[PDB]
């Protein structure tokens, strides 16, 4: 189907404790594949998925130099923002940048993204047409006019429609044995005595990829939401994901309830009974 590549940059100032910490992570779909940490000893962009390890020294030098340069220009941007918002030099602040691209099943460009945030709040973003900017306030509007005059959007569009897409296709092909595979959820149920009058049925979905999944309960075929609890999807720590949904039922009525699991890796949805 469709795929995405995303890079997430974070700089965190720490006045009195040296230079800001910069971190970069890169993802393809729900799989992290690179990382950079300015506090780490390596000072290198590093592989975090096996299929990226085959890239040669040129790839690693270039990616390292580029994110290293970002850590350095981020320090300038932090100073600029502090001036824009008239903030003292004593406080700690954060800048975040997200960018990347989506392609369809045919590997062709679908859309591009570039957004920036200061202290967790939107600052500036490239519109979806990749030709103009939207600014969240007047400080950001200052950046917008500057980037308009300098035709910054054109540089981003060239990257997002060209370079970004070309690398994403390459990663998809090189990592196809995993990136283009689905791991269907492994499902089971547990039963827990709440009181003498009630019990909890918990329906589990484990070891699945990608993260997208839907877990629901039915009671004699009727959708149930009351007395249900659905936890947020969480990483197993091995590249796969976990989720569960539970329902409180009158003791003796367990048999009325069915758990339903929908996932990309399932040719048809699962129905689990206790």
């Amino acid at each position: 189907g469709s795929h995405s590549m995303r890079y997430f940059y974070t700089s965190m100032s720490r006045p009195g404790r040296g230079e800001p910490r910069f971190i970069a992570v890169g993802y393809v779909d729900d799989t992290q594949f690179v990382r950079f940490d300015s506090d780490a000893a390596s000072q290198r962009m590093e592989p975090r998925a096996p299929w990226i390890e085959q890239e040669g020294p040129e790839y690693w030098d270039r990616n390292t130099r580029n994110v290293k340069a970002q850590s350095q220009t981020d320090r300038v941007d932090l100073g600029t923002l502090r001036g824009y918002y008239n903030q003292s030099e004593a406080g700690s602040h954060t800048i975040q940048r997200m960018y990347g691209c989506d392609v369809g099943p045919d590997g062709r460009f679908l859309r591009g993204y570039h957004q920036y945030a200061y202290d967790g709040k939107d600052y500036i973003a490239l519109k979806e047409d990749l030709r103009s900017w939207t600014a969240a306030d007047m400080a950001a509007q200052t950046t917008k006019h500057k980037w308009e005059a300098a035709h910054v959007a054109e540089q981003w569009r060239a990257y997002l429609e060209g370079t970004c897409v070309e690398w994403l296709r390459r990663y998809l092909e090189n990592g196809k044995e995993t990136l283009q595979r689905t791991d269907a959820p492994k499902t089971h149920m547990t039963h827990h005595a709440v009181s003498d009058h009630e019990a909890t049925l918990r329906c589990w979905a484990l070891s699945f990829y990608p993260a997208e999944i839907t877990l629901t309960w039915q009671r004699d075929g009727e959708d149930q939401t009351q007395d249900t609890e659905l936890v947020e999807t969480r990483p197993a720590g091995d590249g796969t994901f976990q989720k569960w949904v539970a329902v409180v039922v009158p003791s003796g009525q367990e048999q009325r309830y069915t758990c339903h699991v929908q996932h990309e890796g399932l040719p048809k949805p699962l129905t689990l009974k206790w």
């Binding site: 990616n63 580029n66 970002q70 500057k146 370079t163």
Partner: peptide
């Protein structure tokens, strides 16, 4: 692969 041009706020 990451972007490689220089732009400041």
């Amino acid at each position: 692969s990451v972007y490689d041009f220089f732009v400041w706020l």
